[PDB]
Amino acid sequence: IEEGKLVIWINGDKGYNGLAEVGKKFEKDTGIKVTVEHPDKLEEKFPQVAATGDGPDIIFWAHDRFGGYAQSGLLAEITPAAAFQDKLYPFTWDAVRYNGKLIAYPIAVEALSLIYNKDLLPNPPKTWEEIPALDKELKAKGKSALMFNLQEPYFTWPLIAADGGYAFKYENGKYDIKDVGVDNAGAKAGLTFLVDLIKNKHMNADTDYSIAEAAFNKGETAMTINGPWAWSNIDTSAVNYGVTVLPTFKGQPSKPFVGVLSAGINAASPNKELAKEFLENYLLTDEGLEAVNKDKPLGAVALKSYEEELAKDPRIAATMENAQKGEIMPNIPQMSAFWYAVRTAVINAASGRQTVDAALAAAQTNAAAMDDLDALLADKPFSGLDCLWCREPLTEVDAFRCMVKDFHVVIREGCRYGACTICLENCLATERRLWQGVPVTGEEAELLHGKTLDRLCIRCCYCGGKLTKNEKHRHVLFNEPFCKTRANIIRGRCYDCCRH
Ligand SMILES: OC[C@H]1O[C@H](O[C@H]2[C@H](O)[C@@H](O)[C@@H](O[C@H]3[C@H](O)[C@@H](O)[C@@H](O)O[C@@H]3CO)O[C@@H]2CO)[C@H](O)[C@@H](O)[C@@H]1O
Ligand SMILES: [Zn+2]
Numbered sequence: 001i002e003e004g005k006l007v008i009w010i011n012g013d014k015g016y017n018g019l020a021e022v023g024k025k026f027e028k029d030t031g032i033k034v035t036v037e038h039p040d041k042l043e044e045k046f047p048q049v050a051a052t053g054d055g056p057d058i059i060f061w062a063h064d065r066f067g068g069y070a071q072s073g074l075l076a077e078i079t080p081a082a083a084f085q086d087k088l089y090p091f092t093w094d095a096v097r098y099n100g101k102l103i104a105y106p107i108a109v110e111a112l113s114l115i116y117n118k119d120l121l122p123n124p125p126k127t128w129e130e131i132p133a134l135d136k137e138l139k140a141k142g143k144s145a146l147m148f149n150l151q152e153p154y155f156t157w158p159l160i161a162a163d164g165g166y167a168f169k170y171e172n173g174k175y176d177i178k179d180v181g182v183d184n185a186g187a188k189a190g191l192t193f194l195v196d197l198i199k200n201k202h203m204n205a206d207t208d209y210s211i212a213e214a215a216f217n218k219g220e221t222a223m224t225i226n227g228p229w230a231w232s233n234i235d236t237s238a239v240n241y242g243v244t245v246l247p248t249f250k251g252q253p254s255k256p257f258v259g260v261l262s263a264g265i266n267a268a269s270p271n272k273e274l275a276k277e278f279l280e281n282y283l284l285t286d287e288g289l290e291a292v293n294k295d296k297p298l299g300a301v302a303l304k305s306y307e308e309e310l311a312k313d314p315r316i317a318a319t320m321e322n323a324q325k326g327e328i329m330p331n332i333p334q335m336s337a338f339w340y341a342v343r344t345a346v347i348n349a350a351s352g353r354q355t356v357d358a359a360l361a362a363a364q365t366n367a368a369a370m371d372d373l374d375a376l377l378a379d380k381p382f383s384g385l386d387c388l389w390c391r392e393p394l395t396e397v398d399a400f401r402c403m404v405k406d407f408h409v410v411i412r413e414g415c416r417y418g419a420c421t422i423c424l425e426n427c428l429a430t431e432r433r434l435w436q437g438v439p440v441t442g443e444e445a446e447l448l449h450g451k452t453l454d455r456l457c458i459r460c461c462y463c464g465g466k467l468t469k470n471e472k473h474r475h476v477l478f479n480e481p482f483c484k485t486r487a488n489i490i491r492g493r494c495y496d497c498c499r500h
């Protein structure tokens with residue numbers, strides 16, 4: 001990392017241009033150049049890159065990612081004077097505390113709200129249950145009731161949580177990573193309601209961020225679910241919009257997961273002092289936050305003095321009312337696994353690839369561990385057995401595949417299980433995304449597991465199948481490295497799984 005300057009990473013939906021202006025003031029005052037960048041998948045890139053001591057000096061993201069960053073020792077400890085701490089709301093500091101240490105600066109507080117087109121819908125619906133009938137009305141005029149991003153569990157979670165869904169139960173002073181509320185009766189109800197909106201053609205499974213945004217900002221749909229960052233583009237459109245409380249579901253409020261946008265400092269940064277000066281005395285000020293806010297709205301902010309200005313805005317009170325009805329996201333390392341698990345269940349259920357029950361049962365298993373994967377894919381009959389994950393009976397092809405792939409029967413509470421292809425593939429996909437491997441040679445693998453390559457059990461990172469002697473030799477012969485993932489596990493690619 002270059003010494004004498006600041007590189008800052010922040011997400012593309014945020015006011016990076018405004019932040020750049022703060023960055024130019026810092027430069028005019030100190031002579032230090034600040035470069036603001038908005039890399040795709042920055043939150044996944046940061047941990048790969050920072051582990052080798054590269055990356056940005058400062059990284060911005062909601063607080064939920066930061067526990068994982070801190071655990072891996074990627075973040076500098078933040079030590080602001082008590083005077084400074086007093087400038088921000090206490091709960092925001094709590095969001096960036098990990099094992100008794102402050103690991104980032106809180107910037108702003110974020111919650112989803114219902115955004116609606118006053119001209120098309122002067123009085124927005126109070127319940128999710130009214131949408132179906134309302135959509136029918138609007139379709140008559142070539143419009144739709146509701147579009148929003150269904151690709152990200154962040155947007156669908158408020159509904160899933162409404163009737164009892166939850167991530168980790170908080171108890172005995174800590175989130176209990178073994179008590180996950182992802183396949184309880186309330187989650188199923190909420191996901192079932194969502195899936196029925198899709199079967200009945202009130203929404204498309206394919207809708208993503210860009211598609212819902214365009215549709216709303218061009219007057220084609222009456223409602224959308226988004227955060228404060230989205231308001232700036234609606235302003236610039238012809239749309240006359242309101243911001244209000246999310247609908248209820250079975251008479252219970254929708255429960256958004258509340259994020260605190262936070263700025264962490266790379267442990268490997270040689271510019272820690274400069275980073276702290278920038279953040280404390282330039283960004284976390286009335287003028288600094290306003291510069292960023294004018295670009296893309298921040299939502300409620302952590303800085304008391306400026307939040308007082310922002311609080312007069314009805315869109316902000318609506319933001320805070322939805323926030324009070326939701327929960328502050330946990331920052332524990334297990335959150336990544338939770339988010340991936342739910343993302344997959346929603347995508348699967350919405351396309352009909354799996355039932356709601358199957359999809360949530362798998363999500364439940366994935367959110368609470370990966371011990372099951374290791375048991376199934378141990379180093380190295382299935383017919384009539386169910387899938388460990390989704391609890392559905394293995395078809396006879398999936399039973400065959402379990403055998404040919406050289407899987408191991410998993411016993412849970414006395415019962416024997418295999419895995420269907422869908423759950424197995426989703427699980428391995430999450431492994432690659434959650435544990436970026438480092439490349440290793442055959443020699444490195446042999447040395448690590450005191451065993452010749454022909455005798456090492458190396459599995460395909462896509463299908464879980466045990467690589468043949470020739471498949472392993474392919475890696476060596478053609479200079480294609482193996483992958484060292486978690487627990488010193490070594491993965492490779494079978495002939496069939498050699499993507500372009
Ligand atoms: O879906 C897989 C996804 O899971 C995790 O992403 C979550 C974020 O960690 C979490 O903060 C939240 O992201 C939202 C931001 O808070 C908000 O400011 C704005 O940017 O919208 C974001 C949602 O798109 O929720 C997501 C889950 O949807 C994980 O960190 C990701 O790496 C992973 O891709
Ligand atoms: Zn399954």
Ligand SMILES: [Zn+2]
Binds near residue numbers: 462464496
């Ligand atoms: Zn394979």
